[PDB]
Amino acid sequence: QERRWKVAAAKKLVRTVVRHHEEKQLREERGKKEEQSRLRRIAASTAR
């Protein structure tokens, strides 16, 4: 049973870490996108 269980523990840890990397990168990208959108919006404020 211990054999069965630690392999599962390793697998779940791998899934956790891969998911973490994923949101890290997605947050980076979406932050950039929001920044440029805000810049366009302030330029549209100039246009206002």
Added chain:
Amino acid sequence: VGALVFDIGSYTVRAGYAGEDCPKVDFPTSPLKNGMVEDWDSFQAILDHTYKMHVKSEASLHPVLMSEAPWNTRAKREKLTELMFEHYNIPAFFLCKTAVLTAFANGRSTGLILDSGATHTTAIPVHDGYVLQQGIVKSPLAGDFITMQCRELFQEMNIELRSWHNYMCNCVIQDFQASVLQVAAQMPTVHYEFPNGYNCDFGAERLKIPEGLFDPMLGVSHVVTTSVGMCDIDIRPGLYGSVIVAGGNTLIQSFTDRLNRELSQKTPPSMRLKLIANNTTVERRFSSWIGGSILASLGTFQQMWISKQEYEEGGKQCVERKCP
């Protein structure tokens, strides 16, 4: 405290107050070979020469606005704010693209701009007051190229066309352009006289010299038609109905006219392509300064500058934050 608006253009500097119609000082610019400050010290010196000799007023009192090239690199802007605030200690600052001011001078936010200076002629489509960096097309077939045709075509004439003599040598080839260059196929021509009295019957040279910017490299028409290609798809009709021209280098006889034909025959005929005829030198020479002068004057400029305050609380980073 009347706001000061300076244009640091590549070949001449146009300087003046926000509330006045004309730049009170327009003198030759060099630290701006490529389009941005190549020599900060020479740049700083000519700026110093501006505040003291050209306008006879300290920079520490009036609010100040500077205009910059559309394609310029950021590092220039951060350093400019760094140099400007540190040395001159201005109360308020701002940076705007020359193309943006022209569209502001022409009272048309959404448009496409054609201008040329030292070594560069570019196409910049501006939408909603925003320059589409991706849409910019920069070509070398600037006025300098055409004048260099003039100079060589003068040297072949074998006329006698220290740095001041070079300034004179350059000044004449430009002056000849305004009088003569128009865009046996030209019929009898002018009798333009040099100050010493030398002259010649300037024949087809007046017609072939200007043709270089269309056909010496991307011609001005090719510069623009592609630029709109690179921009968005559906705003393109807006740009075509809003094309504008600025810059003293663009001052050639039937120039704007030939541009209309080249585009009218290149654009789809169904399009509403229109050129705004600010063809007068005074219009073209002031167009950039006019937009800046208007910009500084307005009552919402009171929140738009980078006050001296923003520069203490934040360093160079503010430039990217306050100026689109």
Added chain:
Amino acid sequence: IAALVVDNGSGMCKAGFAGDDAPRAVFPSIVGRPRDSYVGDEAQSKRGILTLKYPIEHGIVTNWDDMEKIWHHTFYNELRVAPEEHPVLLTEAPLNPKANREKMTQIMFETFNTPAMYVAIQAVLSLYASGRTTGIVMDSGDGVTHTVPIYEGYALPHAILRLDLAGRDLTDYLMKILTERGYSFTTTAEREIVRDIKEKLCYVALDFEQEMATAASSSSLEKSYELPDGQVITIGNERFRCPEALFQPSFLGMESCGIHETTFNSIMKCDVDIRKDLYANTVLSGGTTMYPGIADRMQKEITALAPSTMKIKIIAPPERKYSVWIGGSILASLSTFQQMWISKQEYDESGPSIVHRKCF
């Protein structure tokens, strides 16, 4: 509350706290000894009455008192923290005897009495830092070498390979050849200076033979370095003579499979079904292992020896000097891993063996 990460390099300790990017304090892991025994650089500063000592021999512990005191001084001066209110995460080389594991667990619990403890291999934590699922890890550490094929965040002790060759032996050989060039390098200062020169100009040759031809013909390889005394050293072929020893143990009179040869052996020791993926998931290790021309040359060598029918996608993080510690910070910064900690009362109710019952 705080989170503690302890990375113990083969010859330099580099500790820090979870969530941090870089270790709190870093220094070589040496121990003084009076003819008060002082720690690392603390001992080094007092060389007159303290003698240098390496508790991490061969990448392995020597005497429990030595690292007891390294932790003593760590906590009291560098961290200047109360770890006994924070979890304590520690790392180890693979194939470590259970004796060392129980010993360190007991030392932690009794000597320092910190609530939460847990241990995990260096290589797997570095892989976690590398953000990949399945692959093979090369442990080009600092004092010892290993090849860890990690699968599903899970490794097979048998498949691993070992070799006690690392930056220390490379530096010793480089010192030897530099002395042979007509120089001399005896004391600690000379050792560190040789390591400095290596870190500065030494690199990994692409075609070692044509590299010899160029060094003996193109003096550009022969370069000038200001020694601490100021002396300028011409350094040509020797810029990369030592690194080639990695693939050629004969350089030092040793006989074994080169680094990539060792790696091929290891990947063969695995199961064929996923060796293609392993090839696709190369790894690197060691801050003393980033020398130019190394990743590309190793890539070429694997492409050659490894059948091209499989995809050999190398992985050479230029920031791997802390890979293990960085992975440790990441892990300690995970929610589901918090439960997995081990409490002091759990030791009090099960003894040290609880680590081998749970700490995996």
